[PDB]
Each structure stands twice: as structure tokens, then as C-alpha cells.
Amino acid sequence: MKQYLELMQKVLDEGTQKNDRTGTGTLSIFGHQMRFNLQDGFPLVTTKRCHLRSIIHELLWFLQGDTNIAYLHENNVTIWDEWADENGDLGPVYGKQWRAWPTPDGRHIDQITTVLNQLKNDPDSRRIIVSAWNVGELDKMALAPCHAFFQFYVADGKLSCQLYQRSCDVFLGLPFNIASYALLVHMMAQQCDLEVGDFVWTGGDTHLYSNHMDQTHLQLSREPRPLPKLIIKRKPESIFDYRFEDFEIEGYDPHPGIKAP
Amino acid sequence: MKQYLELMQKVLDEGTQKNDRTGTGTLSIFGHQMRFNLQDGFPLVTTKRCHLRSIIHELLWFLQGDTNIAYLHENNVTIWDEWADENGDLGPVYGKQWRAWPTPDGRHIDQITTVLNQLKNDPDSRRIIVSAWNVGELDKMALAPCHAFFQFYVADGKLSCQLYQRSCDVFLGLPFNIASYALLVHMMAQQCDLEVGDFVWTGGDTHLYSNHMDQTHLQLSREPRPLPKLIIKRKPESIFDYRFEDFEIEGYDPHPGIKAPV
């Protein structure tokens, strides 16, 4: 995607050399923003084939509030395997905070249910937010939230969403992360009888890993293709009732997939 | 400031006419990002006279973890007065979450101390963050956090900070918000022996209130003047020991103040 490729090139040109906690190098920049008008097409990177199957299953899993990889395992999604403990647990990552953020008195807050009611009853609210950044639970998580905070906004019948991503793996994670939130906007818009607006992506520490440099160079030598079109084939009873088969991508014409360590 | 006037113009050019919570119309855009290199000068708006006095007091108050207006009121800073209850309390707003976010198991996390330790000992950490967005306590607050989540970053000996501001009053609030976080960056950099980098400002629902339009167009007819300079006169033993008199602003020559209704 044009904006995605411009970001890759900016990291290459301006990124500073850093040594992460694993001793793996990265080139990194701080602070970047991109905007995708969802009426122009579904923002699935075309300069490498991206498998939407894992993107969809991960999002559905987040929305169920599940933090055990069993469901991902039942569907051959392995992206979370290395973080899980022997029991397949990740601690209270993403999904748990989205659906049952724990309060000190023993209660839980369902941010997704709150957002859906805010969209339906108070669409001009300036606080239609979901935060996965539960400071009090970070130590229990396998990974502190990278795509950490997001906000919805409604104008002229269109639903937009902005994500604050505190740590971004540009080559491997970003393509996935953009598609995930774009999909969520389509699902929320459908459930609230709205059209799709923009997906605004904001990055904090935004980096390319040193072992993704050959892959990045290959990807940047390719020209982007017109974006695909997302089709939802069935309108479920709620935002929590989607299934994998409800989504179809049409007109997706990517360059060959690119493997990275 | 150029960036600030450009944002005002963007809201005017692209914003959607809506109605705020109280009905008071707003013009709003969603999603914006701008950067201030703090080595260029302290980012205090010059196209209208802004008083740094109130900004400093508010930041020292946040850093103490205070949520009662008494300290502000005593120092003739009245920006929070309208929000307070009969005893002066705001509920667990900004300062309380910064200094003592309550966990589920009964602990309290001092996020400011955490960030200072991360800057000194692991400056390349990708999670040097402070969040005031405590989902469990939002409805106990007089105002849910507008400047809600911020992250620090270090490169080439310089400290940068990015703020995610979910709701922004462009005319009245923004000049204060930018100066507040820029001051914080200077303070943190001093405490960690770092130089200042950039302050990156990102907006969510970014709006101009309908009753600030003539004030906004008046401000947009003026040319930004050179940025002022910030001089910190002492290096306290901790980030929580700064005093009002430690900060001095030099070379501030703004256009006339422009009053506006909140």
C-alpha cells in the first residue's frame, strides 16, 4: 500500500539503530501516522500476499475475551504459540482487557459492549474508547499490548477508528494489525447501521527488525495494486457472533507472500 | 506556532459540524499529528498571549498526585474550578492515575517513577508509557482524561514524548496542553541527564467550539513570532521536587491575549 511502503522507506532512511531486549537489532523511528479511507478499499497489503485467515481468527478470538490459544490451535493459527505457557495461556492480554477489564473490587468492565452502546445511543461522544493498557495487569501478560488503545468517531453516518500502536513491527506485524482494525470497523459499522469511514493508524516506537531487511528491500521493489473489497456475507445478531465464513475478500491481487524469520 | 495555526486551519477546512455533549456546537476532525523539536525553542503559542504560570502550577499539581483544586485555587489558577465538587475534589483524575493507579490485587503503581526508572536503566524500552485512561475509574472522575496516554522514546541522547489526546479543545485547551507536556519533557530529560528531543502531538476528536470561531479567525490573521526559550534554574533531587520558581521563560513576545468562553 502506498502509505505502508512510504513508512518502510522512512524507517530505512531515518531510523536509528537500536538493540532490543532479545539482542536483535532494529532500525526505529518514533511517531508516525497514516490514514486509510475504508470506502477506497480494504487495506490489505498487496505487495506481499497476506493470509486473512489468521487475521480473522485472531480478531474473533479477541472479541470472545479468550486468552488461551486453544481456539487458535483448533484453526491452525500459530502466531501466538511462542508466548503461551504449557497450558496454552497468555495471561490477561488483549481480549481479556477488551471484554473483562478487572476492577479492584472484583468486578469486570466490558469495553466492547460499552462501545457498541455508545455508538448506538451517543455517536457524537468524544470518549468511544477501548484500552488494552491495563497498567495493573501488565506484569501478568505474556506480552504487553502493542496495539494498545483505540478510539471510534462518527461523522456524516460514517464510522472511523484511530489506533495508538506503542510498538510496531513494520514488516511482520503491521500488515496484520491494519487489516485487523479495518475488519473491526466494518463489523462495528454493520452492527450499528453505519457506513465505513477512515482507519487512522498512529505509531509510537515503529521499527524494522534487522533480520527483515532483505524482505523489506524485496517488498519495496514491488508496485502496489488496487485494494480489494471486503464483503460480509451474513449479518449476525451481535458483534460477538461473527464467524470466519462471514468474510470474503474480492479482487485481492497481491505479489507473492514473503517469509521472514 | 506554525504547526498550531496549520491545525486550526485544517479543522476549519475539513471539520464536520456536530454538537458537543452540552449541545454547544463544535467543528471537528478525527486524527491529526504534529511535532515540535524542543531544541528549536519552547512551544508556547505566540499568536495570543498565554500565561505559563497556570500551566506550571497545573503540572506540579499533577506530579504530586493531587486531585483537589485547593493548591490551584490558592495560587490563583482557576481552570479546574468549574469541575470541582463542593469540597474542591475532582475524583481520581490525571494526577491520581499518574502516581497511584490501583491494581486489582490491591497494589498501586507510580507510573511517573516507573518511567523515570525505565529512562535511566532501559531507555530503548518500547513501553515507557503513562496512561491516565483507567477504565475502572473513569466514571468516578469529574472529567475523563483528555490528554490520555503518553509514551517516551530515547535516540541519540535525546528524550522524545508522544501524547495521544482523545479530546482536544483546539483554541482554549491545546496551547496549554502542548506547553504542559513540553515542560514535562524538559523536567524528565533533566532528571535522566538527557537532552530534549521532540514532543509529538496526536489528536483523536480534535475540535473548535462554535463560540471560539471569531477568536480563531482573529488569531489566524497573526504571524507566529520566534519561539521563547525555557530555562530551568535548579536540578532537584527528584522529578517530584520542582518548585514554581525553578522555571523561567525568555524571549516571549506574543501578540495580544484573546479571551474566550469555556
Ligand SMILES: O=C(O)CCNC(=O)[C@H]1CCCN1S(=O)(=O)c1ccc(C(=O)N[C@@H](CCC(=O)O)C(=O)O)cc1
Ligand atoms: O512490537 C513488535 O516489535 C512485535 C510484537 N509482537 C507481536 O505483537 C505479535 C505477538 C503475536 C501477534 N503479534 S503480531 O500482530 O506482531 C504478528 C503478526 C503476524 C506474524 C506472522 O508471523 N505472520 C505470518 C503469517 C501468519 C498467518 O497469516 O497465518 C506472515 O508472514 O505474515 C507475527 C506477529
Ligand SMILES: O=C(O)CCNC(=O)[C@H]1CCCN1S(=O)(=O)c1ccc(C(=O)N[C@@H](CCC(=O)O)C(=O)O)cc1
Ligand atoms: O476536550 C475538550 O473539549 C476540553 C475539555 N476540557 C479540559 O480538558 C479542561 C479541564 C480543565 C483543564 N482543561 S484544558 O487543558 O482544556 C484548559 C486549559 C486552559 C483553559 C483556559 O481557560 N485558559 C485561559 C486562561 C487560563 C490561565 O492562564 O490561567 C486562556 O485564555 O487560555 C481552559 C481549559
